[PDB]
Amino acid sequence: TLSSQDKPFNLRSRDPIYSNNYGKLYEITPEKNSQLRDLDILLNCLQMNEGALFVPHYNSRATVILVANEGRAEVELVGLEQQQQQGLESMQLRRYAATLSEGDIIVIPSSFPVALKAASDLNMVGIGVNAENNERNFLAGHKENVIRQIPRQVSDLTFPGSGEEVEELLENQKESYFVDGQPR
Amino acid sequence: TLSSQDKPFNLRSRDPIYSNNYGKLYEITPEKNSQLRDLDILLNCLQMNEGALFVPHYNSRATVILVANEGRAEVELVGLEQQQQQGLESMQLRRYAATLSEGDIIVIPSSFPVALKAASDLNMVGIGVNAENNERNFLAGHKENVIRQIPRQVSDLTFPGSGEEVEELLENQKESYFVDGQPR
Amino acid sequence: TLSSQDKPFNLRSRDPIYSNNYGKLYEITPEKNSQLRDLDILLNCLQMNEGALFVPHYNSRATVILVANEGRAEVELVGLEQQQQQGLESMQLRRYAATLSEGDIIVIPSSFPVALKAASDLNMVGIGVNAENNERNFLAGHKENVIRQIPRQVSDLTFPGSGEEVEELLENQKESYFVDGQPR
Amino acid sequence: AQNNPYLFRSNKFLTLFKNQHGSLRLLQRFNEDTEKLENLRDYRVLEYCSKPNTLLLPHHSDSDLLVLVLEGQAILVLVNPDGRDTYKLDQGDAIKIQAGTPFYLINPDNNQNLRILKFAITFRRPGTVEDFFLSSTKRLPSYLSAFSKNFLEASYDSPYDEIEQTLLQEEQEGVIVKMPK
Amino acid sequence: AQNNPYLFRSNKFLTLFKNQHGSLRLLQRFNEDTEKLENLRDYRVLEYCSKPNTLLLPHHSDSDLLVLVLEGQAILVLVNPDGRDTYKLDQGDAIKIQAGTPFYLINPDNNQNLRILKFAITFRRPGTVEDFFLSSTKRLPSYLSAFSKNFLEASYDSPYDEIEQTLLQEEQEGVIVKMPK
Amino acid sequence: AQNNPYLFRSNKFLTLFKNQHGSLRLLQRFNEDTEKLENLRDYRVLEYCSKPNTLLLPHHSDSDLLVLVLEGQAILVLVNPDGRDTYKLDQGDAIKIQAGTPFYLINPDNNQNLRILKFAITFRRPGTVEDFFLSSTKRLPSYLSAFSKNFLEASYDSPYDEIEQTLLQEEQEGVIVKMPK
Structure with missing residues (x-):
């Protein structure tokens, strides 16, 4: 000491990038931290209430590694992925179906869309790869919505x-990133 | 807009690196442009009068990709190239003989000697690889002549x-880069 | 000229990193020299009295190449090295036993422990690889002793x-890097 | 292709998506043929044509792009969290369009086709290029339709019914689309 | 493993050293399985547990480390030529521990295990991770014992006798060690 | 060599060009033998000797060089578009001679050989080293003679006759050359 x-x-986790009553996610970038830049690694932690959901999403350049440290997590993941065709x-377009545990690792590629629901007040660890200025583009919800940014026309x-249709539905879900697992 | x-x-093409009544060649380096450095890509365009010739030459570090956008181009290229011997x-020492068209791509390695003659007021597109401070060393003509820079002795x-012989011939061709296809 | x-x-060799009546070692880092940084190469030369020994040691990130330019050198080298197991x-843990000559090259990996004794007033050339801020950590002798830096407890x-035992023996050898081949 | 002439001259793009209203062809990865072009093995070259009064439907690349107009009048739009970006493209007008963005372009009114030259700078699967289209087409649905009703209803909170019809069509001859506008 | 499911989900670490007092398991290198994870092929993920009142014996890595406490109370020590460095570790407390250092940590007094998550950033043998332990254990001696009496006596100038007994034991169930302290 | 001892010790250079007036040998590429030296796989080590009163004929490398005098008195000349560069070399005197330059050195008057140690830092064909010699020799002509009369006459505008005799000889035992001077 x-x-x-x-x-x-x-270096430790001061604030979530994202905090909702549903969850939290702390995140150190090599842009913030002085050690990191040198590895090209993004630090991240999260906090997911025994009910939250990470809203459908992808990292533009980051392949995330995610070990589930606390709980059990259902992992959903999409991808098209092999042009040697x-x-x-x-x-x-196959769907990656998988729920983890207390020892499970999951790698999330650079542009793949995924979400995790909470099946425990589940704590997640994830180390960000190739991560010099990576965007957490969101396809659902209120914030970080790209779609919503595609014009009416x-x-x-x-x-x-x-x-009509398009514009409105995106507008339904008044939540954010983390959201009601509200299973049905 | x-x-x-x-x-x-x-970013667009302001001026040729080289302009002769015979042709032109516009060229953006990651040294000039702010976006580029980040890819390690050289932009280049050219303009070759229905008669010019690119004088025998090589890029010291750049492997150029060249798609022929307008016309038909005869490509000449030399190389010794495989020491796993x-x-x-x-x-x-084989000779690369080839003339292109409206859809043809040609890759020009880092130190290989080549020239193109014009078989149309032919427009050429080429993207420069590994190109952080690359020299367009010329073996013929007036300018950019290295030879000419080898002393008499x-x-x-x-x-x-x-x-005598050596010194003088280099001195004959009072042109530059682009030159009379003046076929015979 | x-x-x-x-x-x-x-660029030339001004001073040894290490000078003992037993030997010398000159060393240019890409941290000192302006050309080098750009290759990620460490320059080094050495001078080993017809009797010295390079005290058991490793480079933390540098794989050294070592050509023996003058003399004959006995090379000792340790390593554990292949986890595809x-x-x-x-x-x-195999031991690399080898003595060189006037044309011999030896590559010393990033964390491997080795020493050379002198079997001639032997001159050594070595080019340092991956060498942006590399430490010459020493396991024996007075200086550059890491061990000695491990507390009593x-x-x-x-x-x-x-x-007792541990603390004291390290303290016996009042020399440094280069040391008495004093063969027995 | 494959094990053919190890040269530095190529002439056969691969047609990924194809219709008559536009085209999208991929130049084979550099090193396939030869053991001589292993540098650029993580670089794809793309070509994209269309005809006057077209929308390249929305998608994002995993890869860093380079876009060159090898003949035409363009309008490019890159889209984020806080805004859209809007620039009209032209001959030579070359732009950097970095990994992941969701992008869509058009061909305006001035009579002819738009031929684009795209330069890809790859890194997830080096050399390897992939574009996820937002919506649904004949034999390649959406991506958002990959997860289930569960996982999806959750996310908008309006049913797999509402959500579907708005999200799930079969845009006929569609990646590349025509208009009145 | 090997030629199995090309997925982005793994669950079988390899146990390098194993005893009951602690553990040290290695996650297979990323690309083994798939042709889909060739980026990170030069990156290993490490896990390390122990029980309360332990010393991880001294060793140095060839590789650049990342250390994360996935549950526990630590004390880290990196050691050089002019000093030791001393910081007490905690949940989240993540540190950079660069190639080559000789390092040793502990678990203090506050009741439970310490689970560490270690991130390796490799470069001699990319992906490839290796830790040289200072001392001697059951089936993996020291490194200093690799050269001979000659080469070693030379170096301390006190005999292969003195030098041995001080340098050469068989720390029983030992890489991971227990104490009174 | 090939599939032999995976060691970190080598002793067999390959003689590319050979005559008695000088020599030029290439150390095998690092990784050939072993699966243990794959870092430096894109790095060649070169050795070059000659005897007193010699000119290394003009050529350029595709590769970035490092030049070390392992014994001797040199004179180095790198040549460009606007000038030549001129420095006299000495024991230790090590220099950086970057990709592509056309270069030529000599051994002056002070009695003995010049042994040079050259370090290559490769990138077109990684590890792979290649030097294009300006002129013509016994079994390896010039490079300028690779294109034809057409393409060449064009370029100087003095015939494939004049141009030849000045450009095309057979410098006998020649890459490495002797003098009166």
Whole structure:
């Protein structure tokens, strides 16, 4: 422990990037921390109420490693992922179905869409790879919504429903990132 | 389009690196442009009069990719290139003979000597690889002539002819980079 | 030779990192020299009296290449080194036994322990790899002793003998890096 | 292709998605053929044409892009959390469009096609390029439809019914789309 | 493992050293299974548990480490030429412990185990992790005992006798050690 | 060599060009033998000797060099578009000679050989080293002679006749050359 504060000391989690009554997520970037830049590693921790859900999402450049430290977590994950194929028809959109535990590791690739629901006041550890200025783009919810950022006029064109349908549903879920597992 | 000039806008071709009545070549380096450095990519465009020739040459560190966007181009290219051989006698000096079109791509390795003649007022696109401070060393012509930079006394020693022969021929071609296809 | 001092001139060996009546070792880091940083290469030279010994040691990040330029050198080297094994019992601690000459090259991996004794007033050339801030941690002798830096209380715990035995022997060898080959 | 001529000259793109209204072809990865182009093995070259009055439907790349107009009049839009970005593209006008963004472009009114040259700078699966389209098409649905009703209803809180019809169509000959606008 | 499911979910660490007083398990290297995780192929993930009143014997890594306490009360010590460095570790308290250092930690008095999560950033043999322990144990001696009497006596100048007994034991169930202290 | 002892000690250079007036040998690429030296797999080590009153004919490397005088008196010359660069080399005198330059050195008057140690830092074909010599020798012509009369006459505008005799000889035992000077 000691006292001589100086020679490459330490780093801990001050604040969530995201805090909702549903959960929290602390996150150190090599942009914030002085040690890290040098590894190209993102630190992250989270706190998920015995009920939350991480809203459908992807990291633009980060392949996240996630060990479940406390609890049991259901992992949902999508991806199209292997072009060493001579066309598209070939490769497919498979769904990654999996729930973890107290020793489980899960790697989340750079642009893959996933969510985790809570099946315990579950604590998650995740180390961020290739992570020099990575965006946590969100496909659902209120915040961090990209969709919502697609204009009325592209929307129609972009999914049967138009300004109406499209515009409105995104607007239903007045929550954020972490959300009601409210299973049905 | 809009107006809010700021957030990572754009980049275009202001001036040729080289302009002769025979042709032109525009070139953005990651040394000039702020976006680029980050990819380690050199931008380049060119303009070759229905008659020019790119004078025998090589890029010291850049492997150029060249898609022919407008016209038809005859590509000449030299190289010795595969030492996974146990001596030299083994590997050889082959000549890359090829003329392109409206959809053709050509990769030009880091130190290989090549030229293109024009078989149309031909427009060329090329993306520069590994290109942090790359020299366009020229073996012919007036400018950018390295040879010409080899002294009279090494010259003799260096090719049958001496100061005389060597010194003089380089001095014949009063042109530059782009030059008379003047086919014969 | 000339006079126009400027355009990327030169670099030579001013001082040993280490000088003992037994030997010397000159060393340019990419931290000192302006050319080098760019290759991630450490320069080094040495001078070993027809009797010295490089005290048991390892480079934390540097894989050293060592050509023996003058003399004949006995090379001692330890390592455990191949986990593509499913446990530890499997891989082993082998000893690298070898003496060189006037044309011999030796690569010293990042964390491997070795020493060289002198079998001639032997001159050694070595080019340092991956060498951005590499420590020459020493396991013997007076200086650069890490061991000696392990406290009395961990010592016991750490090797049969305790404060007594452990503490004292390290203290016997009042020399440094280079030391009496004093063969027996 | 494969084990053919180890050269530095190629001429066969692979057509991933194909219809008559536009095209999208991929140049084979550099090193396939040769043992001579292993640098750029983590770099794909893309070509993309379309015809006048088109919308490239929304999608995001895992890969860092480079976009070059090899002939045409464009309008590019990159989209985030707090806003959209809006620039009209032109011959030469080349832009950097970094990993992950969701992007959609168009061809405006001035008569002809738009040929785009796209440069990909890869890193998840080096060399390897992949674009996740937002919506649904003939033989490649959406991505959002990969999880289930459960996981999805959860997220909007309006049913797998409402949510579906708005999210799940079969945009016919559609990745590349036409308009009145 | 090997040629099994190419997934992004793993659950079988490899136990390198094992006794009942503590454990040290290695997560298989990322890419083994799949052709899908070749980035991180030069990255190992480590787990290390022990029980209350323990000393992780001294050793140095060739690899750059990351240390995370996934539950516990620690005391870390990194050791150099001019000093030792001394910081007490805690939940979350994560530290960077760079290639080569010789390091030793402990579990203090507050009742329970210490589970550590270690992140390795590899470079001699990429992905490849290796820790040289100072001393001697049951089936893996010391490293200093690899050279000979000659080469060793030379170095301290006190005999292969003195030098041995002080250097060469068989710390029984020992990498991970217990105390009174 | 090949599939032999995976060690960190080598002793067999490969002789690329060979005559009695000088020599030029290449150390096998690091990783050949072992699966243990895959870092430096993109690094070649070069050795070059000659005897007193010699000119290493002009050539350029694709690779970044490191030059060390392991015994001798040198004179180095790197050559560009606007000038030549001129420095006299000495024991230890080590220099950085970056990819592509066309370079030529000598051994002056002070009695003995010059042994050079060259360090190559590779990138087109990693590890892979290649030097294009300007002129012509016994069994390896020039490079400028690879294209044709057409393509060449074009470039100087003096015939494939004039151009040849000045460009195309057979410098006998020649890469490494002797003088009166």
